[PDB]
Every structure is written in C-alpha cells, then in structure tokens.
Amino acid sequence: DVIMYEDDHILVLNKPSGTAVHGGSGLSFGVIEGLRALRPEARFLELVHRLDRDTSGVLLVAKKRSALRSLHEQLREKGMQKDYLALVRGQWQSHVKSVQAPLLKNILQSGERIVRVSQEGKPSETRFKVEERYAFATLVRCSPVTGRTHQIRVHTQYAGHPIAFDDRYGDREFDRQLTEAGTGLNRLFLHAAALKFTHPGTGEVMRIEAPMDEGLKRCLQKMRNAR
Hints:
Largest sheet: 10 strands, mixed
Number of strands: 12
Structural class: alpha+beta
EC number: 5.4.99.24
Active site: 52
Strand content: 25-35%
Keywords: Isomerase, RNA-binding, rRNA processing
Number of helices: 5
Family: Belongs to the pseudouridine synthase RluA family.
Number of domains: 1
Radius of gyration: 18 Å
Distance between the termini: 34 Å
C-alpha cells in the first residue's frame, strides 16, 4: 500500500521513488496535490516534512492543525528518530559514526536544489551505522539529526562514499559498477525506512517502518552475493 497508517490526525505514506512530495515552481504536482485530488473536501492537509523526489519511504502528513502543531515542534526539538537506508560506494569507515559538516542550500533556475558543504552553511549532523558490507559498497543506516535538504546525500558524498544512483552528488562509475554487477538498480538508493515520533492526539510513541520496493530488495540480494 502507499497509505500505511491513517487516523483523524495523521496520514503516513510510503512515498514512491520518482514522485516529488509537492509541485515545483512550474507546471507540476506531486504527492500532496495528488492526495488533495483523491480526497477533495479534506479540511486540512499539510506535509510535516519533505523527502526528495527520488527518495522513497516514510512520509508524515498532518490532517489537523493541532497535529501539525505537534509534529513541527517535535521536528524543531530534533525529537524524532528518522532512520534511512542508503547503499553507498565502497567501504563506509567503521569509526565514522557521524558527519558534522555545515550545509548551504541554493536553488537553481529549474527549481532544483543544490546543497554544498560550506562554513557559510547551516549546522548539520547525520549519524551512521554500518548494517551490511558488500564487495564494493556498504548498506548504511543514516539518521539525520538535523533535517536539512539533501543532508544525507551530501554528507555521504563528503565522507567519500556517495549514494548509489545519486545523479547530483553521486559517482557514475559506481553506478556503472552496480549495473554490470546485475543489481537491476535504476534509482537513488535512499530509503526513509523508519520513523519514530509521538502521536499528536494520543501522546503515544509510534514507530512506523516502510518496506523497500522490489528494485531496492533485488539490488541488495544481488550485492549480498557479489564478490
């Protein structure tokens, strides 16, 4: 399903890779206009946070003003545990538990975002945990503590291990290596896998986890066997 959890307060999606969360500066729409169309007469619907167009996985959407009030505050306080799964080039170093590089975001003519490490950027922190090591790449659990645009993608690139099929920050030779290995992979390997947050109505702590799509799974099966 795309809709993974819904009640009067929240809607939690498993966002597909390839669709933006909302429309751009031009003639486009994304997930949320797409949602207002299958549910006209929604009283209140607002994204709580963003995900990149090619990122998949857990996406929280507020259905009441009180819900967004709550979720905004939990984000600002960095209270949520957002865990992503990324397939990165080569061997992530085991001692690198975090990256702390500041990030400067600029907007291109297309409306595309480009983000670069810079002392003139905003304080940014991502944590990392190695999950599975392969012949030429690593599966890494990446937990952005701050919630900056492109933070994981740029932080991994910065640390020397860009994400597979990352068209902006990535490495076409690694993508070449993945294709020649037979992985099937044809999108950014970045997945919002788990989100833990406090439910705004119940006040109960909630952990939502999104399944990876078959492209990602077949990729990992192949990498588990690569040598």
